[PDB]
Design a protein around this motif. Structure first.
Motif, PDB file in Angstrom:
ATOM      1  N   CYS A 105     -33.955 -22.863  21.879  1.00  0.00           N
ATOM      2  CA  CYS A 105     -34.580 -23.907  22.690  1.00  0.00           C
ATOM      3  C   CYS A 105     -34.934 -23.470  24.085  1.00  0.00           C
ATOM      4  O   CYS A 105     -34.694 -22.329  24.471  1.00  0.00           O
ATOM      5  N   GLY A 106     -35.535 -24.396  24.823  1.00  0.00           N
ATOM      6  CA  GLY A 106     -35.697 -24.264  26.259  1.00  0.00           C
ATOM      7  C   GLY A 106     -34.665 -25.147  26.942  1.00  0.00           C
ATOM      8  O   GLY A 106     -33.947 -25.920  26.291  1.00  0.00           O
ATOM      9  N   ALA A 139     -32.783 -30.631  24.843  1.00  0.00           N
ATOM     10  CA  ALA A 139     -33.049 -31.567  23.762  1.00  0.00           C
ATOM     11  C   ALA A 139     -31.791 -31.898  23.001  1.00  0.00           C
ATOM     12  O   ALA A 139     -30.976 -31.024  22.772  1.00  0.00           O
ATOM     13  N   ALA A 140     -31.640 -33.145  22.579  1.00  0.00           N
ATOM     14  CA  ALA A 140     -30.510 -33.495  21.714  1.00  0.00           C
ATOM     15  C   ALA A 140     -30.491 -32.699  20.406  1.00  0.00           C
ATOM     16  O   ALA A 140     -29.436 -32.240  19.971  1.00  0.00           O
ATOM     17  N   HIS A 141     -31.662 -32.515  19.801  1.00  0.00           N
ATOM     18  CA  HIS A 141     -31.765 -31.896  18.472  1.00  0.00           C
ATOM     19  C   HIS A 141     -31.627 -30.397  18.526  1.00  0.00           C
ATOM     20  O   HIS A 141     -31.720 -29.744  17.510  1.00  0.00           O
ATOM     21  N   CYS A 142     -31.423 -29.857  19.715  1.00  0.00           N
ATOM     22  CA  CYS A 142     -31.268 -28.430  19.892  1.00  0.00           C
ATOM     23  C   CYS A 142     -29.825 -28.032  19.710  1.00  0.00           C
ATOM     24  O   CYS A 142     -29.490 -26.856  19.776  1.00  0.00           O
ATOM     25  N   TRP A 159     -40.385 -20.446  25.974  1.00  0.00           N
ATOM     26  CA  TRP A 159     -40.638 -19.218  25.242  1.00  0.00           C
ATOM     27  C   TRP A 159     -41.075 -19.417  23.780  1.00  0.00           C
ATOM     28  O   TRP A 159     -41.157 -18.443  23.044  1.00  0.00           O
ATOM     29  N   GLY A 160     -41.377 -20.653  23.379  1.00  0.00           N
ATOM     30  CA  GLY A 160     -41.778 -20.966  21.996  1.00  0.00           C
ATOM     31  C   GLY A 160     -43.051 -20.293  21.493  1.00  0.00           C
ATOM     32  O   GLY A 160     -43.694 -19.543  22.225  1.00  0.00           O
ATOM     33  N   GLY A 210     -40.008 -23.985  19.146  1.00  0.00           N
ATOM     34  CA  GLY A 210     -39.263 -23.116  20.047  1.00  0.00           C
ATOM     35  C   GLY A 210     -39.317 -23.494  21.516  1.00  0.00           C
ATOM     36  O   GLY A 210     -38.793 -22.770  22.352  1.00  0.00           O
ATOM     37  N   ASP A 211     -39.936 -24.624  21.848  1.00  0.00           N
ATOM     38  CA  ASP A 211     -40.056 -25.046  23.259  1.00  0.00           C
ATOM     39  C   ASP A 211     -39.154 -26.220  23.589  1.00  0.00           C
ATOM     40  O   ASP A 211     -38.908 -26.527  24.772  1.00  0.00           O
ATOM     41  N   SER A 212     -38.662 -26.866  22.528  1.00  0.00           N
ATOM     42  CA  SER A 212     -37.783 -28.014  22.618  1.00  0.00           C
ATOM     43  C   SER A 212     -36.738 -27.759  23.653  1.00  0.00           C
ATOM     44  O   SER A 212     -36.158 -26.675  23.713  1.00  0.00           O
TER      45      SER A 212
END
Ligand code: NA
Length: 229
Positions: free
Chosen positions: A27-28, A40-43, A122-123, A176-178
């Motif tokens: 993630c970011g 992010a929560a989902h990360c 970095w996504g 990949g930016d989440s």
């Protein structure tokens, strides 16, 4: 980040690149405090203590000698985040060391929820593509609730989520930016955070936008959670 250019070294230095050797996830994030990261929560998977995650900072180039790698200590995932809708998609991470870089202020009101937001991470730059090595930056306009609502095939939650980007232009955040911050300048010439990168239908799609956790709505609930960490 689809169709972005290169972040200059030190430009957005509150930036973090996150790797969760636990859930196998990239993630970011942003330094809310120097040892607390907004993301992010989902990360991440649950709340509680977690020694597993590796935040890298200071560099825009994921490799440089110079990056600072710091392991997570405890993770706070927004209770009430539902994987089922990515609703209420926010989470904090404490670090073991602190990172001595400059941190990102968060909107605590909606005043700044218009116009052109800057995004970064970095996504992948192509939908389906590889993660990057150098932090990419891009600009994306505010998209109204309404405009976004119609255009979306998944359901969009009123004050929790805020939309941004273009109808057709090849410029959007991507897989990949989440967790990276969506932000823009305030009236006092400082970056303020309005979004966390959350989800989108694909990347930079024809007629599709990018969805972001609406920081302003949770800023309160967030501010209160760091103080216990
Ligand atoms: Na588009």
């Amino acid at each position: 980040v689809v169709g972005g250019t290169r972040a200059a070294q030190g430009e957005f230095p509150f930036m973090v690149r996150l790797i969760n050797e636990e859930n196998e996830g990239f993630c970011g994030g942003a330094l809310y405090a120097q040892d607390i990261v907004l993301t992010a929560a989902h990360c991440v998977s649950g709340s509680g203590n977690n020694t597993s995650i590796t935040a890298t900072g200071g560099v825009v180039d994921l490799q440089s000698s110079s990056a600072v790698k710091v392991r997570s200590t405890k993770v706070l995932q927004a209770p009430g985040f539902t994987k089922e809708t990515y609703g209420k998609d926010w989470a904090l991470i404490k670090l073991a060391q602190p990172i001595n870089q400059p941190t990102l202020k968060i909107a605590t009101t909606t005043a700044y929820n218009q116009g052109t937001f800057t995004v970064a991470g970095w996504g992948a730059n192509r939908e389906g593509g590889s993660q990057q090595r150098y932090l990419l930056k891009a600009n994306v306009p505010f998209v109204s609730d309404a405009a976004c609502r119609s255009s979306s095939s998944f359901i969009l939650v009123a004050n929790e989520m805020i939309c941004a980007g273009y109808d057709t232009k090849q410029e959007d955040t991507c897989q990949g930016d989440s967790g990276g911050p969506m932000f823009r300048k305030d009236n006092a010439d400082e970056w303020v955070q309005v979004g966390i990168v959350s989800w989108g239908e694909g990347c930079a799609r024809k007629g599709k936008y990018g969805v972001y956790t609406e920081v302003s709505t949770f800023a309160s609930a967030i501010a209160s959670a760091a103080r216990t960490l």
